Amino acid sequence: PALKDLAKAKGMRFGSAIGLLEDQDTRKSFRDPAYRALMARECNMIVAENETKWQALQPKPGPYQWGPADEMFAWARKEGMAIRGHALIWQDPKWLPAWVNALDLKSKPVAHAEAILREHAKTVCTHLKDVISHDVVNEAVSPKDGSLIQNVFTKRMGAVEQIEFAFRQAHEHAPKAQLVYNDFMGPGLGDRAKHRAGVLKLLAELKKRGAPIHALGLQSHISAGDMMSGPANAAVLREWRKFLDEVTGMGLDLLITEFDVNDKAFPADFAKRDAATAALARDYLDVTLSYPTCRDFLLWGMADHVNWLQVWPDAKRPDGLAQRPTPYDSQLRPKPMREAIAASLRAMPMRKA
């Protein structure tokens, strides 16, 4: 049985990222027909790795660059796959277009910045009118101290004002879409805990103001420091559960949006590493998937050689070896981590209706 079938029997959609623009000579994903076929076999949901980010659509002023997104999403429609929009706003100035970061907003009313954000949101949402879920704001909380990341929009309007406004515009122009705040907070005791607390604060204030946020997106880029079973991990597990408890207590649904497993703390041996990633995936998914409000699960690529962890520098391994962070290897063969995921999908509670 395919991962989408296990996920669907429990009321959960299963999907994956797929890309065209970045890291093409090495991380060739959409242009590989066999990879497309594997994705269509195991998944019924697609997300754009980079093709619907602001930097890809409007890297300079003028019309949007829908070419690659249109191509991949036409493919998704002909293979019967639901589509997410990733992402409307990526808060850090290193993820906004250069001309956007160079805007002179302080000289103009706040209504001007509101007009700019409305234009962007309206364009993106009415062009992508069949999309089921939008990542409205991406990574708006500092993983160092839980403070809100600043940009030329938040400096002018206020951070919470800007995020609330983005969510309201997304709701206005995509009224059938699940609106998600997407970020990579997770289990951990130090800056991980400060990240979780700042994100809880943002979600609490957003629900308090009446903002139309529907869900939190756990990117779930897990590693060996996210281990939760065992006495040594009692506190980490308790605290992670507390975070998810608070989130679903605010009336927020959940998504697993960018799953992969950072293998840099595991041995060079392919078999031992596959076993360690499988057990870690099983533990983390058993904990996180026991929340019936988590109706979506996506892999940030499903083959090792196309995964971003192969080139992202903070994740290079001390030995020269390539990471093995997804459920399929470079030859598109299933790994033990796929088996762990299938087990977690079998043993998890039925999603709430």
Short mmCIF file of C-alpha atoms in Angstrom, two decimals:
data_model
loop_
_atom_site.label_atom_id
_atom_site.label_comp_id
_atom_site.label_asym_id
_atom_site.label_seq_id
_atom_site.Cartn_x
_atom_site.Cartn_y
_atom_site.Cartn_z
CA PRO A 1 0.00 0.00 0.00
CA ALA A 2 1.07 3.57 -0.77
CA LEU A 3 1.72 6.15 1.94
CA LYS A 4 -1.20 8.17 0.59
CA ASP A 5 -3.48 5.15 1.10
CA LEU A 6 -2.43 4.54 4.71
CA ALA A 7 -2.77 8.27 5.38
CA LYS A 8 -6.16 8.45 3.64
CA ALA A 9 -7.65 5.49 5.53
CA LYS A 10 -7.10 7.57 8.69
CA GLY A 11 -8.40 10.84 7.22
CA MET A 12 -5.05 12.51 6.51
CA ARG A 13 -3.64 13.92 3.29
CA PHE A 14 -0.11 12.94 2.31
CA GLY A 15 2.11 15.02 0.09
CA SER A 16 5.60 16.22 -0.69
CA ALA A 17 7.63 19.15 -1.93
CA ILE A 18 8.81 19.29 -5.54
CA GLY A 19 10.90 21.95 -7.22
CA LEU A 20 12.29 23.30 -10.47
CA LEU A 21 14.36 26.47 -9.94
CA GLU A 22 17.03 25.87 -7.29
CA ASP A 23 19.94 23.40 -7.16
CA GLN A 24 19.13 21.86 -10.52
CA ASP A 25 22.37 20.13 -11.52
CA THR A 26 22.32 18.23 -8.20
CA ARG A 27 18.80 18.25 -6.67
CA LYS A 28 16.90 17.53 -9.90
CA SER A 29 13.32 16.76 -8.80
CA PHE A 30 10.43 17.73 -11.12
CA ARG A 31 12.43 17.24 -14.33
CA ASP A 32 13.06 13.58 -13.42
CA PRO A 33 10.10 11.57 -14.79
CA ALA A 34 10.79 8.60 -12.50
CA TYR A 35 10.79 10.89 -9.46
CA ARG A 36 7.51 12.43 -10.63
CA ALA A 37 6.03 8.93 -10.93
CA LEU A 38 7.21 7.92 -7.45
CA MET A 39 5.70 11.08 -5.96
CA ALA A 40 2.42 10.44 -7.77
CA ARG A 41 2.43 6.87 -6.46
CA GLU A 42 3.00 7.60 -2.78
CA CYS A 43 1.45 11.08 -2.48
CA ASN A 44 -1.81 12.84 -3.24
CA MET A 45 -0.55 16.30 -2.26
CA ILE A 46 2.03 18.63 -3.78
CA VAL A 47 3.83 21.69 -2.45
CA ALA A 48 6.23 24.00 -4.27
CA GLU A 49 9.71 24.02 -2.76
CA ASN A 50 10.49 27.55 -3.95
CA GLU A 51 8.30 28.32 -6.96
CA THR A 52 5.57 30.22 -5.06
CA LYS A 53 7.85 32.19 -2.75
CA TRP A 54 7.89 35.95 -3.26
CA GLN A 55 11.54 35.89 -4.38
CA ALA A 56 10.61 33.53 -7.23
CA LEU A 57 7.39 35.22 -8.39
CA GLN A 58 8.45 38.89 -8.22
CA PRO A 59 12.25 39.01 -7.94
CA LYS A 60 12.06 42.51 -9.45
CA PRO A 61 9.08 44.84 -10.00
CA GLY A 62 6.52 44.05 -12.69
CA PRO A 63 4.43 40.95 -13.39
CA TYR A 64 4.69 37.66 -11.54
CA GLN A 65 6.78 34.67 -12.64
CA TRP A 66 4.21 31.88 -12.65
CA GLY A 67 6.00 29.73 -15.25
CA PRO A 68 7.56 27.02 -13.07
CA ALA A 69 4.70 26.98 -10.57
CA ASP A 70 2.16 26.78 -13.41
CA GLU A 71 4.07 23.87 -14.97
CA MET A 72 4.38 21.83 -11.79
CA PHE A 73 0.81 22.56 -10.71
CA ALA A 74 -0.59 21.57 -14.10
CA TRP A 75 1.28 18.30 -13.53
CA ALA A 76 -0.26 18.09 -10.05
CA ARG A 77 -3.75 18.62 -11.47
CA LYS A 78 -3.32 15.93 -14.11
CA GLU A 79 -2.14 13.48 -11.42
CA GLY A 80 -5.01 14.38 -9.05
CA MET A 81 -3.01 16.04 -6.28
CA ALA A 82 -4.11 18.79 -3.91
CA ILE A 83 -1.88 21.87 -3.87
CA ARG A 84 -0.56 24.03 -1.03
CA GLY A 85 0.79 27.54 -1.37
CA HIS A 86 4.27 27.96 0.13
CA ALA A 87 4.65 30.66 1.11
CA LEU A 88 2.90 34.03 1.10
CA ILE A 89 5.34 35.95 3.32
CA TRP A 90 8.77 34.85 4.55
CA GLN A 91 9.49 37.43 7.21
CA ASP A 92 13.29 37.69 7.22
CA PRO A 93 14.59 40.33 4.77
CA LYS A 94 16.93 37.67 3.37
CA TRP A 95 13.77 36.00 2.01
CA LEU A 96 11.97 39.09 0.65
CA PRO A 97 12.73 40.53 -2.80
CA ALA A 98 15.52 43.10 -2.86
CA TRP A 99 13.19 45.84 -4.11
CA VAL A 100 10.74 45.04 -1.31
CA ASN A 101 13.47 45.37 1.31
CA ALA A 102 14.56 48.63 -0.35
CA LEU A 103 11.09 50.18 -0.10
CA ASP A 104 10.69 53.53 1.69
CA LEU A 105 7.60 52.80 3.77
CA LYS A 106 8.24 55.01 6.81
CA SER A 107 7.71 58.12 4.65
CA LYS A 108 4.20 56.93 3.71
CA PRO A 109 1.11 55.99 5.75
CA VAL A 110 0.66 52.48 7.08
CA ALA A 111 -2.18 52.21 4.55
CA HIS A 112 0.55 52.17 1.89
CA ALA A 113 2.29 49.09 3.30
CA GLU A 114 -1.16 47.55 3.74
CA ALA A 115 -1.84 48.23 0.05
CA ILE A 116 1.40 46.52 -0.96
CA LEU A 117 0.69 43.43 1.14
CA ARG A 118 -2.91 43.33 -0.10
CA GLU A 119 -1.75 43.48 -3.72
CA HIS A 120 0.63 40.56 -3.14
CA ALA A 121 -1.92 38.44 -1.24
CA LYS A 122 -4.73 39.12 -3.73
CA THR A 123 -2.55 38.24 -6.73
CA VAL A 124 -1.24 35.03 -5.17
CA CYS A 125 -4.59 33.85 -3.81
CA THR A 126 -6.79 34.58 -6.83
CA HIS A 127 -4.25 33.00 -9.16
CA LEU A 128 -4.12 29.92 -6.91
CA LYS A 129 -7.85 29.66 -6.30
CA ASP A 130 -7.98 25.84 -6.06
CA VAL A 131 -5.29 25.69 -3.34
CA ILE A 132 -6.47 23.97 -0.16
CA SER A 133 -3.96 25.44 2.32
CA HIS A 134 -1.73 28.53 2.35
CA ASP A 135 1.37 29.17 4.46
CA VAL A 136 0.44 32.80 5.07
CA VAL A 137 3.47 33.77 7.19
CA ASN A 138 6.64 31.68 7.27
CA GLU A 139 9.21 31.74 10.09
CA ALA A 140 8.37 34.94 11.99
CA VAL A 141 9.89 33.98 15.36
CA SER A 142 13.61 34.02 16.13
CA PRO A 143 14.94 30.54 17.02
CA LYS A 144 17.43 32.27 19.35
CA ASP A 145 15.20 34.17 21.80
CA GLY A 146 11.61 33.84 20.57
CA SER A 147 11.46 37.47 19.44
CA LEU A 148 9.65 38.34 16.22
CA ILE A 149 11.82 38.65 13.11
CA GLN A 150 11.70 42.19 11.73
CA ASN A 151 11.45 43.46 8.16
CA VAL A 152 10.52 46.64 6.30
CA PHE A 153 6.82 45.84 6.86
CA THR A 154 6.93 45.06 10.59
CA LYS A 155 9.19 48.06 11.21
CA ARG A 156 6.41 50.21 9.75
CA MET A 157 3.21 48.53 11.01
CA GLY A 158 4.33 46.39 13.93
CA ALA A 159 5.05 42.67 13.72
CA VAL A 160 1.76 41.33 15.10
CA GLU A 161 -0.10 43.96 13.10
CA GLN A 162 1.61 42.81 9.90
CA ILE A 163 0.99 39.11 10.54
CA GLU A 164 -2.66 39.63 11.50
CA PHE A 165 -3.15 41.77 8.39
CA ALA A 166 -1.53 39.18 6.13
CA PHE A 167 -3.84 36.51 7.54
CA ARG A 168 -6.90 38.71 7.00
CA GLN A 169 -5.96 39.39 3.37
CA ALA A 170 -5.32 35.69 2.73
CA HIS A 171 -8.71 34.89 4.26
CA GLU A 172 -10.38 37.56 2.12
CA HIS A 173 -8.91 36.39 -1.20
CA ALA A 174 -8.81 32.66 -0.39
CA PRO A 175 -11.89 32.15 1.78
CA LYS A 176 -11.95 28.36 1.35
CA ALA A 177 -8.26 27.93 2.22
CA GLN A 178 -6.78 26.69 5.47
CA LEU A 179 -4.49 29.47 6.66
CA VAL A 180 -1.33 28.22 8.35
CA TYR A 181 1.56 29.78 10.23
CA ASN A 182 4.57 27.67 9.23
CA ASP A 183 7.78 27.41 11.26
CA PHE A 184 10.37 24.89 12.44
CA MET A 185 9.99 25.07 16.23
CA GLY A 186 10.27 21.70 17.93
CA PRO A 187 11.27 19.68 20.99
CA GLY A 188 14.26 20.93 22.93
CA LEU A 189 15.30 22.69 26.15
CA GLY A 190 17.20 25.89 25.31
CA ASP A 191 16.63 28.18 22.35
CA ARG A 192 14.24 25.51 21.10
CA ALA A 193 12.09 26.23 24.16
CA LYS A 194 12.36 29.99 23.62
CA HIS A 195 11.29 29.48 20.00
CA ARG A 196 8.29 27.41 21.13
CA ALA A 197 7.31 30.04 23.71
CA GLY A 198 7.54 32.94 21.26
CA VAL A 199 5.48 30.99 18.74
CA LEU A 200 2.88 30.21 21.41
CA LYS A 201 2.75 33.93 22.18
CA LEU A 202 2.24 34.83 18.53
CA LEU A 203 -0.54 32.26 18.14
CA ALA A 204 -2.22 33.35 21.38
CA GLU A 205 -2.24 37.02 20.38
CA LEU A 206 -3.43 36.14 16.86
CA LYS A 207 -6.42 34.18 18.17
CA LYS A 208 -7.05 36.92 20.76
CA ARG A 209 -7.35 39.62 18.09
CA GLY A 210 -9.83 37.60 16.02
CA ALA A 211 -7.35 36.92 13.22
CA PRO A 212 -8.36 34.11 10.79
CA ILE A 213 -5.50 31.67 11.42
CA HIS A 214 -6.58 28.05 11.09
CA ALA A 215 -3.48 25.97 11.75
CA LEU A 216 0.15 25.69 12.80
CA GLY A 217 2.66 24.07 10.44
CA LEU A 218 5.38 22.00 12.11
CA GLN A 219 8.13 21.88 9.50
CA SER A 220 9.46 18.87 11.45
CA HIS A 221 13.09 18.95 10.32
CA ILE A 222 13.98 16.59 13.13
CA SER A 223 17.40 15.39 14.24
CA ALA A 224 18.91 13.38 17.10
CA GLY A 225 18.15 16.18 19.57
CA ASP A 226 14.43 15.61 18.99
CA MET A 227 14.49 12.12 20.53
CA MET A 228 11.60 11.78 22.96
CA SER A 229 11.31 8.18 24.20
CA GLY A 230 13.34 6.96 27.15
CA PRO A 231 13.93 8.33 30.65
CA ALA A 232 16.63 10.76 29.46
CA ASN A 233 14.00 12.37 27.20
CA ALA A 234 11.11 12.57 29.69
CA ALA A 235 11.17 16.37 30.06
CA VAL A 236 11.59 17.05 26.32
CA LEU A 237 8.59 14.83 25.55
CA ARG A 238 6.42 16.36 28.28
CA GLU A 239 7.22 19.88 27.06
CA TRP A 240 6.61 19.05 23.39
CA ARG A 241 3.24 17.55 24.30
CA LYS A 242 2.48 20.68 26.35
CA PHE A 243 3.25 22.87 23.33
CA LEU A 244 0.96 20.86 21.04
CA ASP A 245 -1.68 20.78 23.79
CA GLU A 246 -1.65 24.58 24.02
CA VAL A 247 -1.76 24.95 20.23
CA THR A 248 -4.77 22.66 19.79
CA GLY A 249 -6.35 24.25 22.86
CA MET A 250 -6.42 27.59 21.05
CA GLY A 251 -8.58 25.97 18.36
CA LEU A 252 -5.69 25.58 15.91
CA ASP A 253 -5.27 22.54 13.69
CA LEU A 254 -1.87 21.06 12.89
CA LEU A 255 0.20 20.14 9.86
CA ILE A 256 3.46 18.30 9.36
CA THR A 257 4.73 20.40 6.48
CA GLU A 258 8.41 19.71 5.69
CA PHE A 259 9.36 16.33 7.13
CA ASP A 260 12.89 14.93 6.87
CA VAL A 261 15.42 13.58 9.38
CA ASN A 262 18.85 15.18 9.83
CA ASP A 263 21.28 12.24 9.99
CA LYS A 264 24.45 14.10 11.01
CA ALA A 265 24.64 12.49 14.49
CA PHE A 266 24.39 8.93 13.13
CA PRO A 267 27.16 6.57 11.92
CA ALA A 268 28.63 6.50 8.43
CA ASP A 269 27.33 2.96 7.85
CA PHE A 270 24.29 3.19 5.59
CA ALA A 271 22.42 0.43 7.44
CA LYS A 272 23.03 1.78 10.96
CA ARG A 273 22.11 5.27 9.77
CA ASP A 274 18.91 4.05 8.12
CA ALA A 275 17.97 2.24 11.34
CA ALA A 276 18.66 5.34 13.44
CA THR A 277 16.63 7.63 11.18
CA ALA A 278 13.83 5.04 11.17
CA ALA A 279 13.65 4.78 14.96
CA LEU A 280 13.84 8.57 15.33
CA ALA A 281 11.07 9.08 12.76
CA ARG A 282 8.95 6.47 14.55
CA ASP A 283 9.37 8.12 17.97
CA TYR A 284 8.74 11.67 16.77
CA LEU A 285 5.79 10.73 14.57
CA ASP A 286 4.21 8.57 17.28
CA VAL A 287 4.24 11.57 19.61
CA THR A 288 3.16 14.25 17.15
CA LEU A 289 0.58 12.23 15.18
CA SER A 290 -1.49 11.29 18.26
CA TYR A 291 -3.23 14.65 17.83
CA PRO A 292 -6.33 13.99 15.68
CA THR A 293 -6.32 17.64 14.52
CA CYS A 294 -3.14 17.06 12.48
CA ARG A 295 -4.82 16.35 9.15
CA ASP A 296 -1.81 16.93 6.85
CA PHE A 297 1.62 15.32 6.48
CA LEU A 298 4.19 16.31 3.84
CA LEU A 299 7.78 15.29 3.11
CA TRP A 300 10.29 17.96 2.09
CA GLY A 301 11.26 15.75 -0.81
CA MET A 302 10.99 11.96 -0.68
CA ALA A 303 14.35 10.96 -2.19
CA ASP A 304 17.68 11.54 -0.47
CA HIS A 305 19.53 13.14 -3.39
CA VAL A 306 16.89 15.86 -3.94
CA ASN A 307 16.64 16.88 -0.28
CA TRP A 308 17.85 20.35 0.72
CA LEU A 309 19.93 18.93 3.58
CA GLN A 310 22.49 17.73 1.02
CA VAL A 311 23.71 21.27 0.27
CA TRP A 312 22.49 23.47 3.14
CA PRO A 313 25.85 24.13 4.83
CA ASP A 314 24.85 23.92 8.50
CA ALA A 315 24.02 20.23 7.93
CA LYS A 316 27.13 18.92 6.16
CA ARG A 317 28.50 15.78 7.79
CA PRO A 318 32.03 15.59 9.25
CA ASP A 319 32.75 12.73 6.88
CA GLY A 320 32.23 13.60 3.24
CA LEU A 321 29.17 11.38 3.08
CA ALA A 322 25.80 12.47 1.74
CA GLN A 323 22.81 12.64 4.07
CA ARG A 324 20.14 9.92 3.90
CA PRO A 325 17.22 11.94 5.33
CA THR A 326 14.13 10.81 3.35
CA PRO A 327 12.16 7.52 3.07
CA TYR A 328 13.69 6.69 -0.36
CA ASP A 329 17.32 6.45 -1.40
CA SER A 330 19.02 7.98 -4.43
CA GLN A 331 17.94 4.95 -6.50
CA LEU A 332 14.27 5.54 -5.54
CA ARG A 333 14.26 2.39 -3.37
CA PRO A 334 12.26 2.39 -0.11
CA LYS A 335 14.32 2.65 3.08
CA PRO A 336 13.48 1.45 6.61
CA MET A 337 12.31 4.98 7.45
CA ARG A 338 9.44 4.54 4.99
CA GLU A 339 8.53 1.42 6.95
CA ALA A 340 8.64 3.40 10.21
CA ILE A 341 6.36 6.06 8.69
CA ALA A 342 3.95 3.40 7.42
CA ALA A 343 3.82 1.91 10.92
CA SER A 344 3.17 5.31 12.49
CA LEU A 345 0.37 5.87 9.99
CA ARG A 346 -1.12 2.47 10.85
CA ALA A 347 -0.99 2.94 14.63
CA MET A 348 -2.12 6.58 14.85
CA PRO A 349 -5.63 7.59 15.96
CA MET A 350 -8.30 8.43 13.40
CA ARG A 351 -8.26 12.12 12.57
CA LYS A 352 -11.08 14.23 13.97
CA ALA A 353 -13.79 15.02 11.44
#
